[PDB]
Write a protein that binds this ligand. Structure first.
Ligand code: MN
Ligand code: MN
Ligand code: MN
Ligand code: MN
Lengths: 360, 360, 360, 360
């Protein structure tokens, strides 16, 4: 089986909040097997180097031509080849690897998690981002998610308003939910070290379980200092833009927790390298997302199932934000977790009609 | 006097809780003197590289043949020879050295502690592990041990349940006992650094005297960071698997207290090297155990009696967990301490009948 | 397919030099497929914690019972389970993983290298150890190996004689061979830092390509200092006794090259974690061996074929030292390299007659 | 057996060069056994805190009164007591411990080396200091010592003349002796780091085997820097004025070799602690001296016989410098080594007549 064609399709899907743009990859092999992958980001170029437009242009012009003709069953050789011709471009690489893994899983009749070694679990805990902006509404949404047993871990995005306004908001939510939920924050690099010093103390003293990426990745020393002084543990996300960054942060002691994202590392196998480095250093894990649809979510999930331990769970709730999907199989969210079947590949198939309807 | 025969016998003894497996060593010398030693571990291979089965196989096939014929009175030459042919195998080496020291003590008419230089005390404070799992039962067992004046220092094994569940358990016990007892914990490498950050703070703020091995030995930086930030002092145990590890941790500032175990270092003389290194660095001491019976307990005790100071006492309570013993002389636990006589060798003799009864 | 039986057989084979002891593992699965593995060391306990006797005792008593009944096709779950019940025991784990990988390769019809991701090459460069002790003989053996195009990279084991005697020996060999061969040394931890200082300079100034493990693993600082001052690069071998050690050495900058041994890490998949860590740090690779027969050699080789780059080649020449083998398929050494076929599993089958003949 | 009396006698003996002052200790025990020790220095207060006069005054007024009445057979308890009442005073402590060890050896019928664990050798290599000041004479004395097979390792004391004058002297001696002798230097803290930089390079490039204490102990950073840059290894001597200093230097990486002196550490047992620390760090050893007579030399020797390895030999040639002695048994210097018998204690007895003749 050889790789015959690779198609990168930009799809705009409507959300429950506005749209979300996905780059769906379809890799057709000579044995008739097709693999599907996903390369998705948030806000064009605001949360990464790659935009949907940039991802497609590079796949069509550089990445895809390098793979047509190669053995579809030798994923390592294919991905190493891409590293030799292309610096970075991890989101694009992630979609490509996800698709090759899907095709290979269907070919051998095994779930991607088994291709990656074997799963140690069948479900993953999923956190939920309370994003209404209104404290009263957030507490209400949280009480609801707990009621229907969908989520018991909540994430708050802060950093866009005055520090003291965001702190009041977060402390109020943890105060009202109490021990019934785990409350965490994500500052998305918005604070400088001088603002984080007091903010991390207040949050830590008021029961916040972890503080995700409080300051910018450019401030390495600041990350090391905050890792040693904050009452609540520091998780790195944006600081990891490659597997080598993970080693660097580990060697430096810049964070006690690493967020694992297939898009930021280069695919399901790449994310496992990063996880392995963290494991060898004793750094805790968390399954992150770039708000992918079901393809990217399942591609992430299949890798996370092989991990010994994910101390802080995951946030694979991307499909729950989309009103319409492009696959036929809806993901199973039940009892605070996402459940992954033992079907071949990623266990998903495209809905040709909805795909054609939402493809731009 | 030459070494003529060395026998390694696996013995399964019943406990008050299940069984405990010991490897009893018998070294017979040409002058008719016999020395007895012990090499014991907990849970097969779960708490160390050496299992009872592995210990015996290596003694019979490699270690013992190297000693038959050598002067029984030159312990240094014998132990150095073993280091030259065998990497690691500290538990096995510990049993062998204990036996040679016992034989040499009987030969010269001196207690092993005197062979090791001279004792500065005749008794050692002994801590007790509250292991029922039930908080109410633990407090009750603790009140009892205080009542009969057997123990006033208590150790709790945590880390197998959710962090917050274990913290509640430990804080409740310290709350109810108050200043009448010293309460300490042992996490047995079960937490990662991200979990330990908050856990060490809560424990330290609630009167826990020390936190033993909170995180894995693989996380060196984490140990150094926790040593600088935890309100309660950090004790290293599993991180020491040799005398050289002790130097490394001392040079790094990875712990302010070292647990001393003859099995983890290579014998009574080896444990003294580790203690000496700690002393030269200003690191506090604690007499640890691998739940040995009376032979291994006394072998440890004889070395600990020579120490200038053991700030945190010891936990030489192993014989109290066994319902049956293989020696004739029961250890004296009285007034919160273990008392060591001034009899030759380890001051113990085998009970041939019980030995034959429990030997597998 | 479930794991039904696991047999650990000690086999003594004759060498061209004396014997070599192997522990052959046979794992039988419920679908009729059998996987074979190997756990071998050099000199009993002289080059590691595990002896052939210790390896078998632990497999029979602890490791094997934990696997009987588990899915043979979920290697990750099986190996993670072993890490949970057994500390260390990497040689034993390496044999077990090699066997599971072999069985799984035969089951799916793929070579182990493909199970591990996909090979990027079909052959590996192989170095040869000149071990006659006589300089004149060594040069002769080297000229011969170059003549028949079997080896062009030579390794010298030094450290057992006076420093200046070993230096003369090594310099003479490089002097006479010139640019036709690559000459490297291995000191096997025999020098202390004070001896290595001058020795590394002389060797480096006289064309020796690399210096393998000059000083003991206990001297970490010394390794860091030698890594910064020696004219010839420093390779770590004995310092790596686990994947976590590799991270530590990388973070410390203790060596610019890592020797990769499946036995020291825990198996083919484990050695890949170590290699990944090195790659993320920019550390060069070398395929090492513990003088394994064809099973262990091929198990190592299949993992090394997936690596992007092995700057310093390999030393997979173990089968060339044995006069008799226990497999039917002889390895192909041709044109300075070892060639690996694309047959299922490790591509080897046992010779039942020679096995029964050499099994102790 | 209790300690009844301790006498500190100042004795002035004539040398082959001038006199050498010794402080002979005689400890009489209630069982009739007497132990002899020695506390000696060079040049009053020029090479240490303690002078012969200061040593005696402190023994008579503070140290001795603290021991009268204690068990003579519990050396550990006695020495620990002294550490509790007296800061430093290592030379004095060294004499006292040597005497207690001698008495205890005679009491049990064992050589001190056996009390310390057991010897691994019966002789020690001895270096010789060429001190005539004249290059031509030094070469001649060296050729002679090689001829009669007394010494093959030579030490040169430099630093009192202009750097370039001393360098010429040392290089000429190594040039003329060639590979027949090992040439080493001792700068006795005389250079500052700026002078040592070039001097260490010249010496290292011209075959000098090691450079002993080139700069002052006050310059720690300078020692660390020279340890990393000098072509020839750096040995610490004056930097060690206690066992704790040894740990500090080891942790810092200030030297690759440690000189072991009983007088600088506190006695035979104390020097073993220092040696153990070095061993755990991978630092090479050398048996040093303070130009002691036979009592102090043998007291040092008995401890050095227990050491696994002394890479750079010893310099126990003190008795060869004295024309008259105060003991009856002359030391055996033969075939480049000092030979130690297996007689009880230090194996020496006082010559009452010569003692009374040279006692001041
Ligand atoms: Mn984030
Ligand atoms: Mn412990
Ligand atoms: Mn090697
Ligand atoms: Mn000196």
């Amino acid at each position: 089986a050889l790789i015959e064609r690779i198609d990168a399709i930009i799809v705009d899907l409507p959300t429950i909040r506005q749209q979300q743009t996905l780059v769906v990859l379809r890799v057709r092999c000579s044995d008739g097997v097709e693999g599907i992958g996903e390369a998705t980001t948030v806000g064009g170029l605001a949360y990464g180097y790659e935009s949907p437009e940039g991802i497609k242009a590079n796949i069509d012009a550089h990445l895809a031509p390098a793979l047509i003709g190669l053995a579809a069953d030798n994923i390592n050789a294919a991905m190493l080849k891409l590293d030799k011709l292309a610096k970075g471009n991890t989101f694009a690489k992630s979609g490509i690897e996800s698709a090759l893994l899907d095709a290979q899983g269907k070919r051998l009749g095994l779930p991607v998690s088994e291709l990656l070694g074997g799963r140690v679990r069948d479900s993953l805990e999923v956190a939920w981002t309370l994003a209404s902006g209104d404290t009263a509404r957030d507490i209400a949404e949280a009480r609801h998610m707990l009621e229907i047993r969908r989520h018991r871990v909540f994430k708050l995005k802060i950093g866009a308003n005055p520090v003291e306004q965001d702190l009041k908001h977060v402390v109020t939510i943890k105060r009202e939910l109490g021990d019934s939920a785990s409350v965490r924050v994500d500052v998305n690099q918005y604070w400088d070290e001088s603002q984080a010093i007091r903010a991390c103390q207040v949050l830590g003293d008021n029961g916040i379980d972890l503080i995700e990426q409080p300051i910018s990745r450019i401030n390495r020393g600041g990350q090391v200092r905050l890792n040693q002084r904050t009452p609540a543990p520091i998780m790195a996300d944006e600081s990891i833009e490659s597997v080598e960054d993970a080693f660097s942060l580990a060697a430096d002691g810049a964070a006690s927790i690493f967020a694992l994202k297939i898009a930021k590392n280069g695919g399901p196998r790449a994310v496992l390298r990063t996880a392995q480095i963290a494991e060898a250093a004793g750094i805790g894990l968390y399954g992150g997302t770039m708000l992918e649809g079901s393809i990217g979510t399942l591609a992430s999930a299949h890798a996370f199932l092989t991990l010994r331990q994910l101390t802080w769970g995951t946030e694979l709730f991307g499909p729950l934000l989309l009103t319409e999907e492009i696959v036929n199989e809806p993901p199973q969210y039940r009892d605070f977790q996402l459940h992954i079947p033992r079907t071949p590949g990623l266990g998903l198939t495209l809905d040709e009609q909805r795909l054609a309807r939402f493809a731009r």
